[PDB]
Every structure is written in C-alpha cells, then in structure tokens.
Amino acid sequence: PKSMQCKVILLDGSEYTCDVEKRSRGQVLFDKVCEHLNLLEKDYFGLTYRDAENQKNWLDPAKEIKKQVRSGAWHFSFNVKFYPPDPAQLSEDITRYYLCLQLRDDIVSGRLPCSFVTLALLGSYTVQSELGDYDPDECGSDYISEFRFAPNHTKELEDKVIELHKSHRGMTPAEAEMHFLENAKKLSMYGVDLHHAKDSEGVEIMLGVCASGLLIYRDRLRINRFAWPKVLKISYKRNNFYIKIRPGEFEQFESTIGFKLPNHRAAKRLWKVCVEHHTFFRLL
Numbered sequence: 442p443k444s445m446q447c448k449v450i451l452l453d454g455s456e457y458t459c460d461v462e463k464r465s466r467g468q469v470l471f472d473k474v475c476e477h478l479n480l481l482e483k484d485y486f487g488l489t490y491r492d493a494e495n496q497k498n499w500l501d502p503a504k505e506i507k508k509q510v511r512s513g514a515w516h517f518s519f520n521v522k523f524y525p526p527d528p529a530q531l532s533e534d535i536t537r538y539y540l541c542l543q544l545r546d547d548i549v550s551g552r553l554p555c556s557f558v559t560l561a562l563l564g565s566y567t568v569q570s571e572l573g574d575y576d577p578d579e580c581g582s583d584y585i586s587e588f589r590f591a592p593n594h595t596k597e598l599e600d601k602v603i604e605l606h607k608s609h610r611g612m613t614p615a616e617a618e619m620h621f622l623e624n625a626k627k628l629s630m631y632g633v634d635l636h637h638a639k640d641s642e643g644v645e646i647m648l649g650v651c652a653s654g655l656l657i658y659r660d661r662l663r664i665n666r667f668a669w670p671k672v673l674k675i676s677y678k679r680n681n682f683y684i685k686i687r688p689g690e691f692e693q694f695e696s697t698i699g700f701k702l703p704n705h706r707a708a709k710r711l712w713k714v715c716v717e718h719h720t721f722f723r724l725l
C-alpha cells in the first residue's frame with residue numbers, strides 16, 4: 442500500500458501534515474483534518490487547493506484526490522465552505538471558533554468589506570478571545586497588536602480596538618466569539634463567494650453565491666438578487682453560465698439570464714458552488 446503526504450494550511454496559519462493511500466477520496470483527508478481540529482460540525486467546512494492558475498478549487502470529498510490535484514502538489518487549505526446564516530444555532534463553541542478564524546482572514550484579505558468601526562469592534566472581540574481582559578501593562582499609547590484586523594492597518598484603528606477592548610472586561614473567549622459572529626453575520630458580503638463574469642452585453646459583473654441565493658453586481662445602482670426559490674435551474678455550456686428565473690405570478694414563461702465566464706473551468710466551478718449552496722438552502 443502506497444501513501445501520499447498531504448500538507449494542509451489550517452485557519453490559524455499553522456500546517457498539518459498526514460499521509461493517505463494514493464487512491465484516497467477527499468473525505469479521507471478531510472476526516473483526518475477534522476479529527477486533528479476536534480471538529481464535529483464538519484459539514485460547514487471543506488478543503489481547497491490551488492491549480493497552476495493559483496485559482497482556488499473545492500476538493501470534492503467523493504472523488505479521488507489524485508484526479509483533482511492532477512499535476513499539482515498535495516497542498517490544501519482548510520476553509521469554511523457553507524457560512525451558517527445564524528452561528529448562534531451551531532451546537533459547538535469550537536465550530537464558532539473556526540468560523541471566527543475564517544472570517545478574520547475574509548476581513549484581512551478584503552473579501553469581506555467592513556467599516557472602520559466594525560473593523561475595530563471585531564478586532565476588539567478577537568483580542569478579548571485571544572488575550573482576555575484589557576491589560577494596560579502590555580498596551581501603551583504606541584501599541585500595535587500582533588493580530589491582523591484589516592486589509593490595511595492604521596494607528597487610529599489600533600487605538601479604537603484598544604478603546605473597545607477596555608469595554609469587554611470579564612468576557613470569556615466563547616462569549617467574545619459569539620459577539621464577533623453576531624456582528625460579522627450582518628455584513629452585506631458575509632458568506633458571499635464572488636465570481637468574475639460578463640453579462641450578455643459583455644459588461645464586467647460579479648456573481649455572488651451565498652445561503653440566500655444569487656447576487657448579480659453590475660454597479661452600485663445596478664444589483665439583482667434572486668433568492669433560491671426564484672432560481673428554477675442553472676447550467677453551464679462551454680464558458681457560458683445560464684440562470685433560469687421563475688416567472689412572476691400570472692406570467693407564463695421563466696426568463697434566462699446568460700453570463701460569460703473567463704473559461705470552461707471557471708463556468709464549471711461557478712455551477713458546482715451554486716448547486717452545493719442551493720442544496721444547503723433546501724436543508725435550512
């Protein structure tokens with residue numbers, strides 16, 4: 442029996458290394474990672490890898506790892522796949538903990554835009570969780586935290602994190618993580634997976650996939666939102682991604698909106714993440 446070494450980047454930036462039989466399906470690796478993380482509520486999570494385009498792909502747990510990574514290194518990242526719309530309803534604190542770690546990276550990366558005050562408030566709950574009660578001895582008027590809070594850091598943001606941290610005295614890590622999530626879950630891009638596309642007129646848009654449905658972001662004045670109940674069907678042909686939208690009451694025919702993706706793989710990727718989120722919505 443021949444085993445391949447897997448390297449997984451965990452959400453605190455640490456690296457986990459294990460071996461699986463070379464014909465292993467994704468689930469085998471994932472089960473090992475989740476056991477290492479003491480994670481039971483595993484269905485919200487997944488493993489990603491990067492292809493030679495350095496684009497992110499979900500490792501399909503049902504398929505052989507080798508037929509997915511193909512020519513690439515057996516190098517993966519552990520990630521939230523399905524963002525819970527109501528994290529307070531997860532059964533375990535450790536589940537909320539990993540969700541917070543993912544959202545910290547969503548914020549620092551700019552995937553999850555955040556006002557100055559929300560950056561500072563989220564940062565303040567992270568500090569309370571990671572370090573406990575505010576301690577002036579560590580701080581000082583010139584303090585910069587080790588923690589990454591934002592896509593760009595400013596002294597004003599560091600100061601506001603400390604001001605709000607003072608107000609959390611006595612808060613336990615589980616409580617500070619619940620507060621982090623109660624705030625983050627309300628942000629307009631929470632759990633939104635964005636895909637570059639062109640509309641049928643060739644205008645650059647973003648397609649957003651999330652729990653509630655499909656977002657078409659043309660510009661600030663031109664946004665469309667299709668809750669899952671309004672989406673009949675989706676398809677990809679070559680580089681094309683098509684959405685069928687139910688008729689409004691007393692209309693006879695669905696409408697088709699068409700999108701051009703950069704290539705066939707990007708269309709297939711968008712299709713699969715939409716199917717997977719749709720199946721999530723069905724079970725909520």
Ligand SMILES: CN(Cc1cccc(F)c1)S(N)(=O)=O
Pocket residue numbers: 672673674675676715716719
């Ligand atoms: C697997 N499908 C189900 C689906 C229905 C409605 C919305 C969806 F995002 C997915 S499909 N590819 O449309 O035939």
